[PDB]
């Protein structure tokens, strides 16, 4: 690319697999939405903020591609495997479930700043401390705190109501 | 009729049984909100959800009316029967007896949309996919929904004044 | 389910085939969209038509989701596979696959249709009515008007830079 | 200086040098856009993108001199040597140079950080990061973009016209 | 002094003891503050609220500094010791840790008036009456109320997610 400067094959690789990572995630929380909303689990507000999700992740993958672009690397796009599961249980199970994927996703964002430091590429490590790095801080706290408030609500059915009703 | 065309005596004779379906339902649901009213039973959401659903079916009856007369039909109408119970129980009991009704209006849509295909009647397809068809499958999920909550929640008497309060 | 009521099997499951081809064709779209932003391609208003594309596509996708919980069918999800180039050559080029994508869920929709009709199941008949088969329609009229503009135009570098700058 | 505190002098004369690059980059933008100002070129937009980009070069030598002070680190100004051409031929032949002198000044910020880096200077890399890296990456992908338009444009004289009035 | 007048040293010196004791009192809403943000705690009503007195406690000290020095007295600042503990427990066992510590800043201050009282000092006992006595006492009712409503509520997870989200 005429434009490519500093960019190592080994980063622009990395930032087509984080794309799948960040597509596959926004895959889940349509699943996971998606399933709040059957009318024998029926909790909206548990639905909206997995749906919300859905679109978070899938714009981080949209960024990712404009920076993939930015810098002269190539996309390229692979299967977006299905989620992992058909039926998500309950809340408690799939915010669980959403604190792995969390995690997971934020692990690979720091494989690819300690790669982006190996090799010398200031632009990516501020792109990632920029726009994704606190993102999923901020997010994981999130997850981490209505864990507990569920897990204190646990008159299991009153309680999982009760969280949706008042905190979602 | 001066203005009647495509309009089957079949067709014609079914609008006014669904008139006299759609009236029930709306002295059921009025019957189901005064229940509700009662300073023994006193859950105002419960009521007022109800009282809404006896316009709603009113409305519904009203316009399958306006649409007989539109075609050139005549309105025929028949003794209404009071509803099936005086009281009616909890809000479980009551939402469960609202859906069994809600399909039981759905069916009879499905009935005449049936007759109305083997009649080769596209107006009173159209008519029926517009105002009803849709409004009907609303309307029963909503219901699954609740039915799903009022469960989850069932310490019975405090899950009937939750609900109550922060769904409806 | 509770409020499941003329709802077959078969159609459950064309719809969930249907969620699948929808979410490949969004997909299909962000790869075509990010396409145009390279720096060796830069067609910012090609870019664009493709990526409004993959949202509308998503949003189909999402419908028929809520639709199956509606009718109290269950969502089933599967891989999505890659779109089936990486590079996609000119504007031409890429507009020709859009119509061929496009005719494709097309012909799905008619399918699916044909099924709701052999299955007597009048509210899916106007689902795909309503929100489905006139969009397709105006969708395929207006990429067709592109494509012999485009073919019009083709000085081919001259053609398409005054395509993208004058119609997208 | 009373406050300079993990401010090497490495830094600080690279600093310097900076700043004239930066002043150099000014000057060359003011050359080309006048060029296009000539009655014998008279490319409007050309000159317009190429006076602004005098200014934002100028600005950003600015604050490398502010930063220079807040470090208690001490301005040298040395020459400024004029533009490498005076006649700068086609808009293509300009746009070519341009990106060139952005990824010369790239390259200069890339070491700057290094040379941060390897001095353990954090507050020099958040300098940079904030302020001139992505303002590099993004202009220098705009300038591709536009390359490749130009490129796909050249008759010559028609293509620099129309390139002019529809995209700059 | 030269502005000095009818200001023992005895209520100069328990003004600045008063001051270290408000210090002390914002240091522990600060620490209670905190352990109820640990995603581990996570009752962001309770945060709130002893965040928002360690503000009221600090500017109770600053109120007290500024009338040390309109009267002539000598602010004279000692180490502020670290709160009594480290982590708080429940909603309750933080609301009883609270009220004993409001308890004792009011017997402070109530000492403090006996001493002006004393000293004939008028215009100290006037100060304590505009801007403490009556706030600790509508504090403390404030806290009674809220122990009262917690104890009530102890299923106890169920009873401390409630109280945070519908009194705080
Ligand atoms: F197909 C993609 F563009 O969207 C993915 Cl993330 C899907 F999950 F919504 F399918
Ligand atoms: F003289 C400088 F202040 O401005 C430089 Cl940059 C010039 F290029 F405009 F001359």
Same mark, same amino acid.
């Given at each position: 690319?005429?434009? #490519? ?25 349509? /699943? %996971? +939405? ?10 909206? +507000?548990?639905?909206?903020?997995? #749906? ?13 591609? *404009? ?18 599961? &058909?039926?998500? =249980?309950?809340?408690? &199970? ?8 969390? *995690?997971? %996703?934020?692990?690979?964002?720091? &494989?690819? @700043?300690?790669? =982006? /430091?190996?090799?010398? &590429?200031? @632009? ?14 901020? %997010?994981?706290?999130?997850? +981490?705190? @209505?864990?507990?408030?569920?897990? #204190?609500?646990?008159?299991? =059915? ?11």
């Amino acid at each position: 690319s005429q434009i #490519r400067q500093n960019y190592s094959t080994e980063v622009e690789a990395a930032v087509n697999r984080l794309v799948n990572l960040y597509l596959r995630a926004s895959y889940t929380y349509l /699943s %996971l +939405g998606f399933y709040f909303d059957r009318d024998d689990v029926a909790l909206e +507000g548990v639905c909206h903020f997995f #749906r919300e999700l859905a679109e978070e992740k899938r714009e981080g993958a949209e960024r990712l591609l *404009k920076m993939q672009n930015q810098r002269g690397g190539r996309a390229l796009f692979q299967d977006l495997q299905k989620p992992s599961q &058909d039926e998500w =249980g309950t809340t408690l &199970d799939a915010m669980k479930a959403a604190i792995v994927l969390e *995690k997971s %996703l934020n692990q690979a964002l720091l &494989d690819l @700043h300690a790669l =982006g /430091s190996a090799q010398a &590429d200031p @632009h990516l490590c501020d792109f990632l401390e920029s726009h994704f790095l606190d993102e999923e801080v901020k %997010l994981i706290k999130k997850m +981490g705190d @209505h864990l507990t408030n569920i897990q #204190r609500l646990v008159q299991a =059915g009153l309680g999982e109501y009760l969280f949706e009703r008042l905190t979602l």
